[PDB]
Design a protein around this ligand. Structure first.
Ligand SMILES: CCCCCCCCCCCCCCCCCC(=O)OC[C@H](COP(=O)([O-])OCC(O)COP(=O)([O-])OC[C@@H](COC(=O)CCCCCCCCCCCCCCCCC)OC(=O)CCCCCCCCCCCCCCCCC)OC(=O)CCCCCCCCCCCCCCCCC
Ligand SMILES: CCCCCCCCCCCCCCCCCC(=O)OC[C@H](COP(=O)([O-])OCC(O)COP(=O)([O-])OC[C@@H](COC(=O)CCCCCCCCCCCCCCCCC)OC(=O)CCCCCCCCCCCCCCCCC)OC(=O)CCCCCCCCCCCCCCCCC
Ligand SMILES: COC1=C(OC)C(=O)C(C/C=C(\C)CC/C=C(\C)CC/C=C(\C)CC/C=C(\C)CC/C=C(\C)CC/C=C(\C)CC/C=C(\C)CC/C=C(\C)CC/C=C(\C)CCC=C(C)C)=C(C)C1=O
Ligand SMILES: CCCCCCCCCCCCCCCCCC(=O)OC[C@H](COP(=O)([O-])OCC[N+](C)(C)C)OC(=O)CCCCCCCCCCCCCCCCC
Ligand SMILES: CCCCCCCCCCCCCCCCCC(=O)OC[C@H](COP(=O)(O)OCCN)OC(=O)CCCCCCCCCCCCCCCCC
Ligand SMILES: CCCCCCCCCCCCCCCCCC(=O)OC[C@H](COP(=O)(O)OCCN)OC(=O)CCCCCCCCCCCCCCCCC
Ligand code: HEM
Ligand code: HEM
Ligand code: HEM
Lengths: 270, 32, 31, 445, 52, 98, 55, 417, 55
């Protein structure tokens, strides 16, 4: 539980860092997306409007917002490093979990002789992919509209965040109410903290719960659908598809998984 | 030998209320 | 226990068989 | 016949009063044995610095020689009928009770009269008795429980006669001559401050005329004018730390100022002191005893034995707990025990209050079986409360107290009150005094 | 959980701790109004509305 | 009837392939570790050997051969009585607390 | 004499962290990403510094 | 308001007395203990004595502890060499619940493996705590060196059996020495009807007499250990006679003739012949006292001594010599009368307390099966004559003797001298 | 059950580093300059960040 909560905090901090950093090049997409995302905080009741004046450093996103975003983008990754150290401490207290879910205390191997070179191979593969992206398709995921001076006199054809932001932004799009949209957006990540409570199956892992495996893959496909919808404009039929997938996300996480776990336990004499 | 153990006199540091050795300390504990 | 006195030693000389005894919320005792 | 019906039966404690002031109290019953004793108000509380320890010396020499009885002839007579004569001198009272059969009552009263009245106090016996007290002083110094309580008394009531040890410092016992003892006997063994108690096959009328025919010579005179006066003592929240690492275990006793002998708040307090309870390693309950602190201690084998005491003198008393544990448990219990107090101070429920009520009722009823406990109860109650409180009244007071009463009483006694901790042994993990005092209050309440 | 907190002694604890927690809530509300200088509340209180 | 569905699920679960009985797969919460401690010596030794062999197998990613799989009718709920006793004791303590 | 690996404080922490820390044998590749994240953190931070040197 | 000494057909004998006391105590006395232990199950009785709170058939350990504590009563399992006494007590309005808990503990234990394994360490803790006082070791070695078997067994688990007593041994001990014919239920402050109902309701399940023990035969050993205590504890004792006999009362009178126990606190024990006899000579802290242990099959009478290491030779000798004088017709009639008065007082004084009366009735029910009034016991004590006392002294002097010693034994004389 | 101060991982480090750390009883004011340095870090870091948001 402790490692999971610290991981959720790390994930929050990483999203904030990336959102903030994408402003720094000050392209058309950077400034316009920043305006939209920060203006989303206006939906907060009472204080909310003042908050967007506070974050902007004025009436709208301007140079003060850019420099404060730069400073916060500098400081935050070191907070991420400290939180990662704490996350590792919490995990190291109890030890990692094997895919089976059964305690592996009887069969434990030293970390240095084995799980250093394996991580070396993993990091090398990650570098293979990353330099493939950098050296052959540099501006692949990034929108070309960033390579344009940020002109506040011209709204871009479509204002969209990064591919790793389009799913929660599509969730925001799905809900009609502005405040409810922000609530759904924050809940779409905060729901990870509820996961320790929603577990009801007697087996910790999923290797022996095929129905839960199908539900998990349905959830993964739903997230892919959210990302694709967030990429697309809010038109027919993208509106209905995005809405339905947004409902199915929470419905799977909160309802289908626990009920499936109850049926799972009942199917195994226990 | 333990009977020979005695607490030294703290009257140099004691507050005015607890200075006397006859009156109790509960009534002055509130004010202190 | 130190028993370096005749008067303090009085009664320590047992004269009846040992009888063990332990309670549930009472400390164990012997005689 | 339910508890209430059996409680009323409770043969009474008819109390009379001789013209000399000796209040003769008895408790008739059916057993053929009896306990007759004289409870005098004489202890370390009345002793001064110069003669501290005279009471212990007089208790030692009481059975030795009594003029009319030449000496060991007293022992011969006492052992002739199988009577067991015993004396216990606490910090306040001092009693000489004969544990004998009912038929030997006329002789037993005479023997007690001989001891309390006509004592030879021979100088040679004083010299012989001087060594014994010094030896007993070394034995008490070896007594690792007695010395921590003496330390608590010294550090709490510092600068007051209460802090004086019952036996006395091992300097007065090497200087106390016949003159000091005779003054102590004259000024403290007075008829008004005496209770002639006897429980068992004792007829109250018989005890009355035996006292009249034997204890008449006692007078309430006080020489010219010198009248000893009870001097109220002050509770001084302090700390004494006698760290001796060679000792195997560590004794720590923590107490705060509590009630007096005559104060209703005594009844709820014991109930609270029953909730915390007591534990020893050889209990058997282990991880299941309802007392939270006891269960916690048994789960981790924290202590070897913790108990809660309710030492209560006339105007003030000591309320707290004495626990014996290894070196690296003193901190933990100091966190836990205090916390328990805090919980009892903060949020107490009727369930554990009822449990404490039942425990206190059981303690009172079971403590009062046999002739000697009843005789001791009569002798102490007449001197302290001015009367023997019947068990029915105790039942009424215990029925009155509930969770709100316990909470308010503990708050008035425990909450944010400076303690009087006193340690012995390898006391190093024992938290600093400011840590203990800070533990006395809870930042949530 | 749900049932294990649904007991008589648990509601006894709740009743015991209602005053302290409730007026801790007042402590927090007063501290928030103080820190933010909330003119909606601070206007009504006397001798402080003069600061506005 | 339902037992066919139960057998199909047991086949599709996976821990029968790894030579694991049912109780080897249960998450180890406080009740479960206390019950495991409460196990007799022989059952505990067989359990730990089975778990270690399964972890080896999934490390190598080799399912245990077909013939000596844990059959449905040969699956024994060894942990179940101890776990039931542990749960009953915990429930009794909680009722006393309430 | 004692091991500098498990007696020196910094080295003791490193040893208990990722030298002699017991680990499950059947850990799949899905856990490697953890370390990858740390790598993808450092490889980020360093690069960011250089970017901050011309921004 | 009297003792109704009913006995059931199965063998259980119920005694009760309605004293109308505020508190009530119910005790089950079982004729089981160390003497019925064998060479294999040594220390099982100690575990059973420590086994008073484990899960029973109809009451879990947590339930038993919580119920007994909330009711406020206690549960003590005081044990002897040949009798184990379970006893509960509390206010008279709720003795039903504690009596049922006791009944489950006695006649329905489960002895779960995990709980017994956890309890194993309590054996070592209790043995150490009890052995802190030197008298326990000396008495245990006395019993080891006095009898070949039976009574030779210790009340405490031997070091090699600590952690080895299995629940199977406990179950064998239970349904081999807890049968109805060898137990007695005695109640103080309880009515006979309810006691009879609970007796015929639960304890009737274990019928029969059970596995009989074995007779104890004198071995005349001299078990000696050099513990290193400054005070040497010694005990020289000969087989006196079985309890419940004329020689038993004669030896009991002889015990007080010799002197046993200081009546006056911090006294000199003038009447005690042993104390005065040894007082001449040695001039260092010393105690000598007659020692009597009247077990059912056989009894032990002798001298117990706590003396200085250097003087241990004298105190053992002189005290023994005193008995010789009593053996060779040197007992005054006045001394016999004083000893009889002391014995009568002691008997009427042990039964004075409610627990004393409880264990007295339990012992009478278990051993003799016929409770006699205290006046009858006093009459039997008065029936003893001087010739019987002088043995009794002859039997102690002539018979072979077992000796036990502890401390610095560099000067303790051996049994051969 | 147990004190969080000496059982929680981070709280254990804080407890044995700053709360229950056995320090010498007679350290003078000169030692206090240690803590000031750390404070003079934080007090100056927080300010230093706020200039970075307008510089
Ligand atoms: C050809 C047809 C099969 C293509 C792969 C898909 C498949 O069926 O995989 C089965 C299987 C994965 O499913 P599984 O065996 O049930 O579970 C293995 C565990 O996930 C543990 O797997 P592992 O870490 O031991 O090795 C495989 C893992 C390793 O993944 C990584 O290292 C990370 C990169 C992938 C994400 O990658 C995958 O499982 C991804 C499979 C699809 C992409 C290839 O993978 C293989 O048999 C070979 C994978 C590598 C092929 C080259
Ligand atoms: C009047 C005579 C002239 C001024 C006193 C100095 C002198 O002549 O002999 C110093 C004389 C001899 O030194 P010491 O007391 O044997 O040893 C050094 C102290 O333990 C070191 O001082 P301390 O730890 O015993 O007590 C702190 C002390 C001194 O505190 C410090 O020295 C540290 C904070 C200030 C550092 C920058 C200014 C130096 O604070 C003060 O004297 C006044 C308050 C200063 C602000 C900090 C609180 O000490 C004093 O008079 C008091 C401490 C030094 C004051 C400067
Ligand atoms: C023996 O004396 C000691 C002190 O003071 C006499 C101390 O203050 C402290 C505690 C000190 C601090 C909490 C702060 C001062 C210095 C440090 C190195 C602590 C760690 C660093 C910071 C608090 C500042 C940076 C952290 C963040 C931005 C310790 C441990 C100490 O051991
Ligand atoms: C949260 C409630 C308290 C703060 C608040 O609304 O106003 C506080 C004070 C006083 O506000 P005020 O009373 O002058 O005006 C309230 C109405 N708004 C907030 C829309 C201007 O304002 C602030 O602290 C700034 C607003 C954001 C606070 C975060
Ligand atoms: C990233 C690294 C994280 C820490 C890894 C573990 C610790 C490495 C450094 C300590 C070490 O290995 O020191 C070796 C050597 C000390 O002497 P040695 O005899 O090798 O070891 C005695 C104590 N075990 O110390 C040396 O400096 C080795 C000899 C000199 C260099 C060749
Ligand atoms: C640059 C560091 C020192 C503190 C360590 C943490 C201590 C802690 O956890 O305190 C919160 C406390 C937890 O419980 P505690 O009272 O410690 O009792 C535990 C019994 N096992 O919490 C509680 O007891 C109750 C929960 C907190 C209540 C707070 C009320 C006031 C809120 C404002
Ligand atoms: C800043 C990025 C992160 C870093 C550097 C990081 C670091 C690590 C590392 C190195 C491990 C061990 C390897 C592994 O199990 O994968 C780990 C385990 C874990 N992390 Fe993270 N983590 C991060 C983000 C997260 C997030 C977002 C979560 C989820 C909220 C999370 C939850 C966990 C969990 C549950 C484990 C234990 C997995 C297991 O034992 O099988 N972490 N973390
Ligand atoms: C947590 C790890 C980090 C993440 C996820 C992150 C994310 C980003 C992203 C997405 C951008 C925009 C890239 C683009 O222009 O398309 C960016 C820009 C930038 N980041 Fe970071 N960053 C991280 C760490 C850092 C650190 C530690 C620094 C400072 C040392 C830094 C300094 C910068 C600078 C100066 C820019 C502007 C240059 C540019 O946009 O290319 N970053 N960051
Ligand atoms: C080792 C600690 C540090 C010291 C001793 C330090 C010292 C200084 C000094 C003396 C100046 C010049 C101020 C002036 O001339 O008025 C300065 C400038 C600056 N520092 Fe730092 N600094 C430190 C750390 C930091 C940190 C952590 C930040 C960012 C969070 C920062 C941000 C700045 C900025 C933006 C300036 C330029 C604005 C200015 O001159 O005040 N510094 N620093």
């Amino acid at each position: 539980l402790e490692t999971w909560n610290i991981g959720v905090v790390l994930l929050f901090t990483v999203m904030a860092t990336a959102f903030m950093g994408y402003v720094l090049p000050w392209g058309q997409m950077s400034f316009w997306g920043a305006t939209v995302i920060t203006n989303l905080l206006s939906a907060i009741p009472y204080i909310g409007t003042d908050l967007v004046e506070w974050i902007w450093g004025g009436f709208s996103v301007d140079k003060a917002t850019l420099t404060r975003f730069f400073a916060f983008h500098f400081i935050l990754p070191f907070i991420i490093t400290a939180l990662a150290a704490v996350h590792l401490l919490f995990l190291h207290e109890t030890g990692s979990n094997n895919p089976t879910g059964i305690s592996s205390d009887m069969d434990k191997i030293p970390f240095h002789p084995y799980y250093t070179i394996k991580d070396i191979l993993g990091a090398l593969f990650m570098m293979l992919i990353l330099l493939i992206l950098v050296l052959f398709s540099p501006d692949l995921l990034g929108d070309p509209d960033n390579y344009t001076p940020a002109n506040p006199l011209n709204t871009p054809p479509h204002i969209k965040p990064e591919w790793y932001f389009l799913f929660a932004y599509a969730i925001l799009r799905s809900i009609p109410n502005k405040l409810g949209g922000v609530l759904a957006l924050v809940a779409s990540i905060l729901i990870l903290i509820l996961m320790p409570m929603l577990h009801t199956s007697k087996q910790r892992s999923m290797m022996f719960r095929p129905l839960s495996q199908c539900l998990f893959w349905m959830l993964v496909a739903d997230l892919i659908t959210l990302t694709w919808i967030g990429g697309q404009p809010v038109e027919h039929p993208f509106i209905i598809i995005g809405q339905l997938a947004s409902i199915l996300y929470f419905l799977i996480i909160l309802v289908l998984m626990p009920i499936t776990s109850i049926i799972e336990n009942n199917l195994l004499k226990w | 030998s333990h009977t020979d153990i005695r607490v030294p006199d703290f009257s140099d540091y004691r507050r005015a209320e607890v200075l006397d050795s006859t009156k109790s300390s509960k009534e002055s504990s509130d004010a202190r | 226990r130190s028993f370096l006195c005749r008067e303090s030693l009085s009664g320590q000389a047992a004269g009846r068989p040992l009888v063990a005894s332990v309670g549930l919320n009472v400390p164990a005792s012997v005689r | 016949a339910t508890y209430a019906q059996a409680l009323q039966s409770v043969p009474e404690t008819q109390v009379s009063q001789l013209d000399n002031g000796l209040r003769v109290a008895s408790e008739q019953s059916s057993q053929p044995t009896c306990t007759v004793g004289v409870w005098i108000d004489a202890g370390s509380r009345y002793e001064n610095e110069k003669n501290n320890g005279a009471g212990y010396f007089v208790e030692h020499l009481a059975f030795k020689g009594t003029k009319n009885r030449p000496g060991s002839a007293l022992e011969k007579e006492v052992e002739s009928m199988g009577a067991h004569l015993n004396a216990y001198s606490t910090r306040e009272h001092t009693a000489y009770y004969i544990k004998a059969l009912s038929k030997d009552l006329p002789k037993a009263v005479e023997l007690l009269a001989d001891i309390v009245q006509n004592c030879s106090l021979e100088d040679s016996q004083i010299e012989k008795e001087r060594d014994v007290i010094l030896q007993e002083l070394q034995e008490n110094d070896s007594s690792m429980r007695d010395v921590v309580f003496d330390y608590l008394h010294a550090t709490a009531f510092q600068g007051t006669p209460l802090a004086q040890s019952v036996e006395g410092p091992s300097e007065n016992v090497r200087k106390l001559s016949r003159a000091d003892l005779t003054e102590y006997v004259s000024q403290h063994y007075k008829a008004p401050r005496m209770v002639l108690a006897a429980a068992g096959g004792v007829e109250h009328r018989q005890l009355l005329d035996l006292a009249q025919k034997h204890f008449s010579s006692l007078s309430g005179t006080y020489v010219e004018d010198a009248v000893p006066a009870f001097t109220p003592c002050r509770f001084t929240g302090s700390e004494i730390r006698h760290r001796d690492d060679a000792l195997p275990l560590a004794h720590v006793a923590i107490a705060v100022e509590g009630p007096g002998w005559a104060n209703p708040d005594n009844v709820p307090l014991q109930v609270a002191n029953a909730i915390i309870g007591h534990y020893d390693s050889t209990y058997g309950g282990g991880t299941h005893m309802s007392s939270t602190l006891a269960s916690v201690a048994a789960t981790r084998k924290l202590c070897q034995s913790f108990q809660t005491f309710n030492i209560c003198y006339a105007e003030t008393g000591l309320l707290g707990a004495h626990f014996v544990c290894d070196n690296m448990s003193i901190d933990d219990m100091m966190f836990f025990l205090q916390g328990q107090w805090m919980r009892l101070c903060t949020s107490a429920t009727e369930s554990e209050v009822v449990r404490g009520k039942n425990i206190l009722r059981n303690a009172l009823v079971s403590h009062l079986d046999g002739t000697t406990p009843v005789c001791e109860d009569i002798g102490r109650s007449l001197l302290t409360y001015g009367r023997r409180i019947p068990l029915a009244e105790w039942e009424s007071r215990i029925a009155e107290v509930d969770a709100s009463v316990v909470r308010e009483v503990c708050s008035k006694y425990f909450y944010d009150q400076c303690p009087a901790v006193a340690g012995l042994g390898p006391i190093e993990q024992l938290p600093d005094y400011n840590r203990i005092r800070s533990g006395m209050f809870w930042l949530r309440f | 959980m749900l049932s294990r907190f649904l007991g008589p002694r648990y509601r006894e604890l709740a009743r015991n701790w209602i005053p302290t927690a409730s007026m801790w809530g007042a402590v927090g509300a007063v501290g928030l109004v103080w820190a933010t200088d909330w003119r909606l509340i601070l206007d009504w209180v006397p001798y402080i509305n003069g600061k506005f | 009837w339902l037992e066919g569905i139960r057998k199909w699920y047991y086949n599709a679960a996976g821990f029968n392939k790894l030579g694991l009985m049912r109780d080897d797969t249960i998450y180890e919460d406080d009740d479960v570790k206390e019950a495991i401690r409460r196990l007799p010596e022989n059952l505990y030794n067989d359990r730990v050997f089975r778990i270690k062999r399964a972890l080896d197998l999934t490390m190598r990613q080799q399912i245990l051969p077909k013939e000596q799989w844990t059959k449905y009718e040969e699956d024994k709920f060894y942990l179940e009585p101890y776990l039931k006793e542990v749960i009953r004791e915990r429930k009794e303590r909680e009722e006393w607390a309430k | 004499m004692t091991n500098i690996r498990k007696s020196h404080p910094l080295m003791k922490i490193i040893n208990n962290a990722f030298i002699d820390l017991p680990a499950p044998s059947n850990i799949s590749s899905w856990w490697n990403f953890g370390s990858l994240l740390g790598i993808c953190l450092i490889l980020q931070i360093l690069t960011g510094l250089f970017l901050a040197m011309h921004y | 308001q009297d003792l109704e000494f009913t006995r059931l057909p199965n063998g259980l004998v119920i005694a009760s007395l309605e004293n109308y006391a505020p508190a009530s105590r119910i005790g089950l006395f079982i004729k089981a203990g160390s003497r019925y232990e064998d060479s294999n199950n040594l220390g099982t009785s100690h575990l059973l004595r420590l086994a008073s709170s484990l899960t029973t058939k109809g009451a879990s350990s947590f339930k038993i502890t919580r119920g007994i504590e909330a009711v406020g009563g206690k549960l003590s399992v005081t044990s002897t060499r040949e009798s184990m006494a379970y006893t509960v007590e509390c206010l008279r309005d709720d003795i039903e619940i504690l009596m049922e808990f006791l009944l489950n503990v006695t006649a329905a234990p489960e002895f779960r493996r995990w709980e017994v394994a956890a309890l194993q360490s309590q054996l070592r803790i209790d043995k150490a705590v009890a052995f802190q006082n030197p008298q326990a070791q000396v008495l245990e070695n006395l019993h080891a060196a006095a009898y070949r078997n039976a009574l030779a067994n210790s009340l405490y688990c031997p070091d090699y059996r600590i952690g080895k007593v299995t629940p199977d041994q406990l179950h064998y001990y239970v349904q081999n020495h807890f049968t109805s014919a060898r137990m007695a239920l005695i109640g103080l402050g309880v009515s006979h009807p309810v006691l009879k109902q609970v007796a015929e309701r639960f304890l009737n399940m274990r019928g029969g007499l059970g596995l009989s023990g074995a007779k104890a035969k004198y071995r005349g050993g001299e078990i000696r250990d050099q513990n290193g205590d400054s005070l040497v504890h010694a005990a020289l004792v000969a087989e006196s006679a079985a309890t419940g006999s004329a020689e038993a009362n004669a030896f009991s009178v002889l015990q007080h003739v010799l002197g046993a126990g200081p009546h006056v606190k911090r006294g000199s024990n003038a009447t005690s012949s042993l104390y005065q006899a040894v007082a001449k000579g040695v001039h260092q802290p010393f105690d000598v006292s007659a020692f009597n242990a009247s077990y059912s099959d056989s009894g032990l009478f002798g001298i117990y001594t706590i003396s200085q290491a250097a003087s241990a030779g004298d105190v053992i000798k002189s005290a023994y010599d005193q008995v010789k004088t009593i053996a060779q017709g040197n007992l005054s009639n006045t001394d016999v009368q004083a000893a009889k008065n002391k014995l009568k007082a002691g008997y009427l004084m042990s039964v004075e307390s409610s627990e004393g009366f409880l264990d007295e009735v339990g012992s009478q029910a278990l051993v003799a099966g016929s409770y006699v009034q205290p006046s009858t016991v006093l009459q039997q004590i008065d029936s003893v004559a001087d010739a019987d006392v002088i043995n009794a002294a002859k039997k102690f002097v002539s018979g072979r003797k077992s000796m036990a010693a502890s401390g610095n034994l560099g000067h303790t004389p051996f049994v051969d001298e």
